[PDB]
Design a protein around this ligand. Structure first.
Ligand SMILES: [Mg+2]
Ligand SMILES: [Mg+2]
Length: 132
RNA sequence: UCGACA
DNA sequence: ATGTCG
């Protein structure tokens, strides 16, 4: 049932909106494959979205067909739509995350991928392996 | 009016 | 508490 041969991604924050980071781990081993430097202001869902898209890019650049697990129904939908429907205000503090989101959407519109993006089933399996 | 995912 | 979708 759990596809162990996969990349798991999650967001961590302090505040929401607040300081946002995300990371990607090997679901089997728990090895940390990428971790993004904290972004001073963002939302949980923005970070969950950026983590997926970072994973797609990471896997694509490495010619890997592994799926990606996320526990975020929001982010999964945003990635599918190629569109992050965040409510976060736009100002000088949120400019960085909003630039990163814009660039993520732009990646999705300029690349193909066959990577299945799967929902991690927290209720049945416990916390996703990339959890902070 | 909630339900659900975080 | 907030950020999001069904
Ligand atoms: Mg999560
Ligand atoms: Mg989590």
């Amino acid at each position: 049932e759990i596809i162990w041969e996969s990349l798991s991604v999650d967001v961590g924050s302090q505040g929401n909106p607040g300081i946002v980071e995300y990371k990607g781990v090997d679901t089997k081993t728990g090895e940390v494959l990428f971790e993004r430097e904290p972004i001073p202001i963002g939302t949980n869902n923005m970070g969950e979205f950026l983590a997926i898209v970072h994973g797609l890019r990471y896997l694509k650049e490495r010619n890997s067909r592994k799926p990606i697990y996320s526990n975020s129904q929001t982010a999964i939908k945003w990635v599918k739509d190629k569109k992050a429907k965040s409510t976060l205000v736009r100002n000088e503090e949120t400019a960085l995350i909003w630039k990163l989101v814009d660039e993520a959407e732009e990646w999705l519109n300029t690349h193909t991928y066959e990577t299945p993006i799967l929902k991690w089933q927290t209720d049945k399996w416990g916390e996703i392996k990339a959890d902070y």
